[PDB]
Amino acid sequence: ATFEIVNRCSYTVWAAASKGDAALDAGGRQLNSGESWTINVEPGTKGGKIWARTDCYFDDSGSGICKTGDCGGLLRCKRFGRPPTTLAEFSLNQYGKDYIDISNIKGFNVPMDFSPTTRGCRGVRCAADIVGQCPAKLKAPGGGCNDACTVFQTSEYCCTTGKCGPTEYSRFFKRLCPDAFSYVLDKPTTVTCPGSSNYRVTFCPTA
């Protein structure tokens, strides 16, 4: 499977890509404005994610920092990212089907489009101006908009039981971004496409 991570943002970003315990394809890139990087994701791959890192410096040694989605300090993300981050997440070939989906459970820090490039199903999207109306207590350290948990690490906000519920915060994201997860116990927003379908990820969708 191929994912086309297109960067439409007016700035530079370091798209990111991990299956959490490892990179997915090349793990990390940097695209300037209007650039795409094409990664081959392994078939049957479970639980990969793609996100975007903001405001960074990495040497000729793949280290450094990013105000957002910093993955243990390194270009080539082999590990998931530091909050706050719009979460592009897929599981492929789990019995004929594929699972695409965007989640704000890890916050928001860049608008995204995750859409199939094949025939089959729908893409999902979360391009509202989150940073723009982020509640000030979610107001982000880097230039994103943090999630309750990353902000209080309280039970409530963290679903630190299993038994959960919605919060005045979870719905800010949900009022804004309905097709994405605003919390764990969130009525899943998954979009089951066809097996082996190819996708396209877009940073700063039409707008």
Curated annotation (Swiss-Prot):
Bridged cysteine pairs (disulfide): C9-C204, C56-C66, C71-C77, C121-C193, C126-C177, C134-C145, C149-C158, C159-C164
Major site of localization recorded for this protein: cytoplasm
Organism superkingdom: Eukaryota
Any matching Pfam family: Thaumatin
Record-level GO cellular component terms: cytoplasmic vesicle
SUPFAM superfamilies in the record: Osmotin, thaumatin-like protein (SSF49870)
UniProt keyword annotations, A-Z: Cytoplasmic vesicle, Disulfide bond, Signal, Taste-modifying protein
PROSITE patterns: THAUMATIN_1 (PS00316), THAUMATIN_2 (PS51367)
General function of this protein: Taste-modifying protein; intensely sweet-tasting. It is 100000 times sweeter than sucrose on a molar basis.
Protein family (similarity comment): Belongs to the thaumatin family.
Protein name as annotated: Thaumatin I
Organism from which the protein derives: Thaumatococcus daniellii
